[PDB]
Structures are given as C-alpha cells and as structure tokens.
Write a protein that binds this ligand. Structure first.
Ligand SMILES: [Zn+2]
Length: 395
C-alpha cells in the first residue's frame, strides 16, 4: 500500500455521480464510503482508495472535471503501520488491541469458562472454509427471557466492530452486580452476541489483504471471490444498490442466503424469533445510527419511534467525549441498497433494528489505530445500554 491515498469527493448533483462512475470504469477504485459508485446519492461526500500507479491520473480526472476533493490519507502505508499502537504489551488477547481470529476464538472459550453463570457459547454453523461461527449468550439464567441480538464483523476490514463485541461482553460480566442498569439488564433479558460473522474474511485481512470485505466463497465461472454478506439477506434481495457481478464488492450472491454464514444467522434468528426483541448490527466507519429501510424509500410503520430512539442514543453517546453521530433511515444516507440484515430482521417482526457505524469520520477510516479502541467502545456502550433500557421498558 506504499503511496496509496484515500480521497474524499464532494458530489453535488447527478453530473458528479456519473463522472465518478466513469472514473471507476477507467481505474480500479476501492470505495470506502459508500460501498460502491451505485450507492452514491446527490449532496453527499464519497471516500475511496486509489492505487499508487493511479494517483496522478485520478487527480487529473478530478481536477479537469471540476470535482472538489481533498486527500483524507496521504500514504496508506503510514496509517497501516501506525494501527498497532496499543500501549498494552502482550501476544495474547487484549480488549485494547485488535485480536486475530485464533485469539478471538480462544477468548470465546475462556470468557465462557470463567463466567458459566453469565455466559454460554454455541456454534450456530460453519463458514465456507469450515470455521465454527460462535455465538455467546450473556445473561443470568432464567425462563422466558426476552433477548437483544447483536452481531459484529459482517465486513472483514471493519476491525473496530469486532473489537466492540468483545468489549461489550467484558462490560456485561464485569459490571454485573456492580452497576444497577447492567445488573437489571442481565437479570431480565439475554444478549446474543455474535462477535465475528465473516470469520474467513477477517482471517484474510490478517494474512493477505487488510482491505478485504466480502466472504471467501468461490463463484461459478470466475476467479472473483466472495459475496457481500450485507447484501445477501432476503430483503428486496438484489433489486437495488447491489451487484449481480461476483467481481463487485457489493455482489449480492447467487441467491438470498447463498452464503453459509448468512444462512446460519438467519436460521438462528428464525429459530429464536419469539425471544428476540431487538437486532443490532455493528459496522464502521462514519459515526451513524441507521434504521430501516435501506432497500426502498418507504418508511417503517414505527418510523417516528425509531427516529426518536436513534436521536436519544446519539445524544447519550456524545455525553462522554463529545463524539458526533448522525442518524436516520438507511435510504436517506445512501442510494437504496437491498439485502441488508437490519431490513430483513425488521420484516421478520423485530421492531427495533439498527445499524451502528462507529468511528471515525474518515481521518483513518477503517484503519482506526488501537489507541482509539477504548474511547470508541466506551462511548458506544452508552448508546447500546440506552437502547437496551428502552427495549426493556417497551416489551
Ligand atoms: Zn459494514
């Protein structure tokens, strides 16, 4: 990644959109925000990574076509080399470092072993490569308990999301019995926490390509690997904002739930639907709380409720470090995109369904340094606990 840059471009009108589409047809562009040229809406900004050999051609294109831009990251190599800046020295698990899959997997076994009265672990299925997909149930044992479901690591490169699910579990077990809200939460409900969904992809970001997003499944008739798991669910599947080309980063897959990982998640949720009252899915970056719908311009029946809940959660998050989040329906932040898990869960009857996009706002983008894990998780905890308390009181 030596000499690679990440650009941000201001798009005003449809002319700017088709210009970016033409640029992306001329050079290989890795869209960071949103996920593809096809998800770009008028009056927004767009972030994308450019290869070293393409920097001058891209800059020339932006300048001569009068697209206003800035360089977010001047040398991606420098940012990548600076990501591992944790002051915690150890080769084992740390909640303040990014942990590889072998380490996270060992952590799921250990944290469960150490806290059997608060945590149980199951494997809800296996990935394309045969890795167990672990799910942790966090709560004091009891009958007929409602549940909140939270997943992290849909997208391989969004490392802060995987880190957050681990932090959440730590907070649940260490504050139970000591902080009144968490104590009430674990007594009355369970959290189902899926710390990494896209395990094969996550491994790939550690071993071969830090910028990988998709699953690692094969596709018929092409060398292009993987499906976008957040375009693989049965929600207006593959009708908008995605791609039928396996070589695209938003490939919807060969069918809804074609991926072992997404099928395992959808099966678990269907099998547990009477219990699950909220669905929370954790991503990065851009500091947003989004709710349905993304697949269509239509609004959910309880739009006013979801908007108010999102507003309150965003305000609660800001109380800690002043971090600013935006919020709203998915289809107001990007061009409509089909096949999302938050939309799917909502259409199953789960009335509280939210996507969280964590820090930052583009300074480091996906490559958030370890030194920000703690503050990111701390403030995010406030929003999650706020949503939990709301859900508990609105059963
Ligand atoms: Zn994501």
């Amino acid at each position: 990644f030596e000499g690679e840059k990440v650009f941000r471009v201001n798009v005003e009108d449809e002319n700017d959109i088709s210009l970016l589409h033409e640029l992306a047809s001329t050079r290989q562009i890795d869209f960071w925000k949103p996920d593809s040229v096809t998800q770009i809406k008028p009056h927004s900004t767009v972030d994308f990574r450019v290869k070293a050999e393409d920097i001058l051609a891209v800059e020339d294109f932006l300048e001569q076509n009068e697209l206003q831009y800035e360089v977010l990251i001047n040398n991606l190599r420098s940012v990548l080399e600076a990501q591992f800046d944790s002051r915690v020295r150890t080769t084992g698990h740390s909640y303040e470092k990014y942990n590889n899959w072998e380490t996270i997997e060992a952590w799921t076994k250990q944290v469960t072993s150490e806290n059997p009265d608060l945590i149980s672990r199951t494997a809800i299925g296996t990935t394309f490569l045969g890795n167990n997909i672990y799910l942790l149930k966090v709560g004091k044992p009891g009958p007929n308990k409602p549940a909140i479901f939270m997943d992290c690591g849909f997208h391989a490169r969004e490392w802060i999301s995987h880190a957050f699910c681990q932090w959440f579990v730590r907070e649940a077990v260490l504050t139970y019995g000591y902080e009144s809200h968490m104590t009430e939460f674990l007594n009355k409900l369970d959290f189902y926490v899926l710390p990494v969904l896209n395990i094969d992809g996550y491994i790939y970001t550690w071993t071969k390509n830090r910028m990988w997003r998709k699953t690692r499944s094969t596709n018929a008739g092409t060398t292009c690997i993987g499906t976008d798991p957040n375009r693989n669910f049965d929600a207006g599947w593959c009708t908008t904002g995605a791609s039928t080309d396996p070589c695209d980063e938003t490939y919807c897959g060969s069918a809804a739930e074609s991926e072992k990982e997404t099928k395992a998640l959808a099966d678990f949720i269907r099998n547990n639907l009477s219990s699950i009252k909220a669905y929370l899915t954790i991503h990065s970056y851009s500091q947003m709380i989004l709710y349905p719908y993304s697949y269509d311009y239509k609004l959910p029946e309880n739009n006013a409720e979801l908007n108010n809940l999102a507003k309150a959660a965003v305000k609660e998050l800001a109380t800690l470090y002043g971090t600013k989040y935006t919020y709203g329906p998915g289809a107001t932040t990007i061009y409509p995109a089909a096949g999302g898990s938050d939309d799917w869960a909502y259409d199953q009857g789960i009335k509280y369904s939210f996507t969280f996009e964590l820090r930052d706002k583009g300074r480091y983008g996906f490559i958030l340094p370890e030194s920000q894990i703690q503050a990111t998780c701390e403030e995010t905890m406030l929003a999650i606990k706020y949503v939990t308390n709301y859900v508990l009181g609105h059963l």
